Design an enzyme around this catalytic site. Sequence first.
Site, PDB file in Angstrom:
ATOM      1  N   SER A 146      11.373  10.133  -0.319  1.00  0.00           N
ATOM      2  CA  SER A 146      10.807   8.920   0.424  1.00  0.00           C
ATOM      3  C   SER A 146      11.971   8.374   1.154  1.00  0.00           C
ATOM      4  CB  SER A 146      10.384   7.914  -0.716  1.00  0.00           C
ATOM      5  OG  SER A 146       9.320   7.361  -0.057  1.00  0.00           O
TER       6      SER A 146
ATOM      7  N   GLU B 259      -0.201  11.476  -1.769  1.00  0.00           N
ATOM      8  CA  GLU B 259       0.902  10.163  -1.235  1.00  0.00           C
ATOM      9  C   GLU B 259       0.495   8.995  -0.999  1.00  0.00           C
ATOM     10  OE1 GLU B 259       4.081  11.171  -0.954  1.00  0.00           O
ATOM     11  OE2 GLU B 259       4.327  13.200  -0.502  1.00  0.00           O
TER      12      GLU B 259
ATOM     13  N   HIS C 119       2.627   9.930  -5.007  1.00  0.00           N
ATOM     14  CA  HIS C 119       3.928   9.503  -4.230  1.00  0.00           C
ATOM     15  C   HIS C 119       5.079   9.557  -5.286  1.00  0.00           C
ATOM     16  CE1 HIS C 119       6.939   8.356  -1.044  1.00  0.00           C
ATOM     17  NE2 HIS C 119       7.120   7.159  -1.844  1.00  0.00           N
TER      18      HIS C 119
ATOM     19  N   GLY D 226      13.099   4.076  -2.388  1.00  0.00           N
ATOM     20  CA  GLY D 226      12.578   2.700  -2.990  1.00  0.00           C
ATOM     21  C   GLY D 226      12.668   2.010  -1.411  1.00  0.00           C
TER      22      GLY D 226
ATOM     23  N   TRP E 145      10.321   2.815 -12.397  1.00  0.00           N
ATOM     24  CA  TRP E 145      11.194   2.712 -11.101  1.00  0.00           C
ATOM     25  C   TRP E 145      11.817   1.545 -11.052  1.00  0.00           C
ATOM     26  CZ3 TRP E 145      10.734   7.221  -9.302  1.00  0.00           C
ATOM     27  CH2 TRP E 145       9.497   7.889  -9.254  1.00  0.00           C
TER      28      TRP E 145
END
EC number: 3.1.1.8
Length: 527
Positions: free
Chosen positions: A196, A323, A436, A114, A80
């Site tokens: 998200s 999630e 998630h 993010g 990520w």
Amino acid sequence: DIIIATKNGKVRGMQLTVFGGTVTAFLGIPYAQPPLGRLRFKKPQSLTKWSDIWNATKYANSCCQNIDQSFPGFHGSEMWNPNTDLSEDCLYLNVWIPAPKPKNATVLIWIYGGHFQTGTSSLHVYDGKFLARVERVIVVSMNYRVGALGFLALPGNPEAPGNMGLFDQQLALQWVQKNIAAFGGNPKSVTLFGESAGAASVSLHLLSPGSHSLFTRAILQSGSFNAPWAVTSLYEARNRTLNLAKLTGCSRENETEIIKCLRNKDPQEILLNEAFVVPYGTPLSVNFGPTVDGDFLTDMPDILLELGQFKKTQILVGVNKDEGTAFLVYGAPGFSKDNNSIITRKEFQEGLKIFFPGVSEFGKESILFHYTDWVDDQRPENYREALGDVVGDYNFICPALEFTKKFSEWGNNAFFYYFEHRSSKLPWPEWMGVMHGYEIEFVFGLPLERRDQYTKAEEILSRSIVKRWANFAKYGNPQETQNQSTSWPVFKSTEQKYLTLNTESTRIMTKLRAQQCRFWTSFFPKV
Ligand SMILES: *[C@@H]1O[C@H](CO[C@H]2O[C@@H](C)[C@@H](O)[C@@H](O)[C@@H]2O)[C@@H](O[C@@H]2O[C@H](CO)[C@@H](O)[C@H](O)[C@H]2NC(C)=O)[C@H](O)[C@H]1NC(C)=O
Ligand SMILES: *[C@H]1O[C@H](CO[C@H]2O[C@@H](C)[C@@H](O)[C@@H](O)[C@@H]2O)[C@@H](O[C@@H]2O[C@H](CO)[C@@H](O)[C@H](O)[C@H]2NC(C)=O)[C@H](O)[C@H]1NC(C)=O
Ligand SMILES: *[C@@H]1O[C@H](CO[C@H]2O[C@@H](C)[C@@H](O)[C@@H](O)[C@@H]2O)[C@@H](O)[C@H](O)[C@H]1NC(C)=O
Ligand SMILES: *[C@@H]1O[C@H](CO)[C@@H](O)[C@H](O)[C@H]1NC(C)=O
Ligand SMILES: *[C@@H]1O[C@H](CO)[C@@H](O)[C@H](O)[C@H]1NC(C)=O
Ligand SMILES: *[C@@H]1O[C@H](CO)[C@@H](O)[C@H](O)[C@H]1NC(C)=O
Ligand SMILES: [Cl-]
Ligand SMILES: [Cl-]
Ligand SMILES: [Cl-]
Ligand SMILES: [Cl-]
Ligand SMILES: [Cl-]
Ligand SMILES: [Cl-]
Ligand SMILES: [Cl-]
Ligand code: NA
């Protein structure tokens, strides 16, 4: 040589080999004046314009952001983290085009998540080349400012008005309207998709009148603006800007002078200090995010949604089965990605305190009462599972369902999914389940690459999701019409049907988390 004439001057692309064919990619096209010096904290300004050729042949800088340093060397977290250099000079977008050049292709614009504090369009799981190659859609993605550099707000003050990163996104949409035809795209067939904080952004683009004419339809993966972490009050926003000012020795009596001082600080000093503006955050805290600015957002978005003031179009909305679990290893006691994280009732109680710091003892008691009705067993993992569901239901699932219900009450087609497949490659441990963030790779078609050791059943599932998403973009209806599939019914208040996505039984169900969401959506706001 692949040179395309845009409104601003020519760009050079490159060819990629994808599944025995070609995709043309333009990585890193600028879409706004770099927001440096006096342009820091301001709305993005339009692009200076150039002769000769811009080489769009590598991903551009990512926006300044704090990096996840919690599990160094660990792929589950580092995947990520940004993978190009961090710079304030980061307003670039990417375009993947099918080969041969399509005549009038539908465009999908990805907006990353993010938590409005991190992310970049260059991640491997956001690579649009497979979509382009498989469905013959054009994929576009942009970098937008995050944290304070993108969301610092002194409302009404155009030196730092708020929502700057949402305006970066909107300027990128405008770039698509104005130029995508030169690439073979249809500006009149643009679907936004995001996950998200990116899905919360897409939903605010449904509410913003400046965005109305810049897209057709929208896909909200695991987020919406009514999630409790997604919109900042104007009181919280000013307290936070004032706090950042104090922390950097930038407190002045003239609101405008504060911004000037902040503009002289180097980005690291601002970044270093963002973490400490919320007086006590949680692992879902957004330090600097969307605000009601009287510009991008002309009123509180709950009021706009409830009173039907939003672009009337179709939506596609969904969540993953677990999630909440990803967040438990970023501060809940007894939780660990390296063991099975069996917690006691006591630890469960302390975990509520971490996620709900402002809430009364009564309020936390009633969370516990609601989630601890075991049928049955007792049954060692009861509390571990309960806390994940608390966090997932309150933060992501109940708000997405509420968003979808309110949206569809004004008469548009909405489609809702529940993603329950755990990637055979997931680097996180088994107890975290269907996390998630981990449907994204299926949407972007990574399991279609048979060199990658996902399973056959995973390639089937992704192929199918890629087709549903492309069908929604192209036609407003996310069917897979050819392979005897389950028909995806519209979601309406009343029946509230949704489709499950998994490798075996895809099925139609109703009223996802009915009891839980009555608790969060109606009772909990009162405590
Ligand atoms: C699962 O691990 C947690 C997490 O903390 C640990 O990381 C582990 C991989 C382990 O190797 C250990 O050395 C490290 O501390 C364990 O909870 C921890 O337990 C101790 C008390 O023994 C506390 O000192 C820690 O503060 C606590 N960690 C946190 C974050 O609260 C946990 O008990 C273990 N769970 C099991 C074995 O079920
Ligand atoms: C926002 O205004 C004040 C300022 O508090 C912040 O100051 C920053 C420089 C930073 O150090 C940050 O940690 C700190 O919270 C808030 O006062 C805080 O909260 C309570 C108030 O009862 C007190 O314990 C402290 O005075 C202070 N916190 C800490 C950790 O020292 C204020 O609450 C906040 N405004 C809100 C929540 O609207
Ligand atoms: C490309 O197609 C254009 C319009 O198609 C769109 O119509 C809208 C109602 C929306 O549904 C889109 O999804 C449809 O695809 C047409 O007006 C243009 O003339 C076309 N341009 C070409 C072929 O170069
Ligand atoms: C852009 O692209 C090609 C490399 O494929 C090269 O011929 C030319 O020098 C480049 N212009 C640059 C790097 O500024
Ligand atoms: C504060 O400073 C700015 C910037 O120089 C100035 O233009 C503004 O009018 C000042 N306002 C007040 C109320 O002092
Ligand atoms: C449908 O069926 C066949 C397998 O029999 C497969 O080749 C094809 O990719 C599938 N298409 C979709 C869109 O799932
Ligand atoms: Cl990478
Ligand atoms: Cl407000
Ligand atoms: Cl479940
Ligand atoms: Cl008790
Ligand atoms: Cl099926
Ligand atoms: Cl029912
Ligand atoms: Cl349920
Ligand atoms: Na009660």
